[PDB]
Amino acid sequence: QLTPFLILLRKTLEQLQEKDTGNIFSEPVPLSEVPDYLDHIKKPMDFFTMKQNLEAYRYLNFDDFEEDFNLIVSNCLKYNAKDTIFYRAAVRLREQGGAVLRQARRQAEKMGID
């Protein structure tokens, strides 16, 4: 059912955001400061946009939620040089966030996801 599922997503998103200790993924990459970003990145994503989507009922299953979180990480690895704070943060977030999503998926299974 939608109510318990959205509560699960909010908690999951909060935990993912807590893993981003440097607040690197909190808001969209500022395109005005990074004008070549869209030359490399097909679909930007960030935690604020995810929260907006969540509250606007755009995540009605777990896969769509996962897909957007995974974009946050994959975009960052793809765009940034390996020796940057950003790339290193994405490597860490993939591992830590991955554990969060594993646990959250198991919870979603216990509810009503297909």
């Binding site: 400061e33 990074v34 030359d39 490399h40 765009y79």
Partner: peptide, 8 residues
């Protein structure tokens, strides 16, 4: 594929 200039 090469990467971007960077975020600074």
């Amino acid at each position: 594929g090469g990467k971007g200039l960077g975020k600074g």
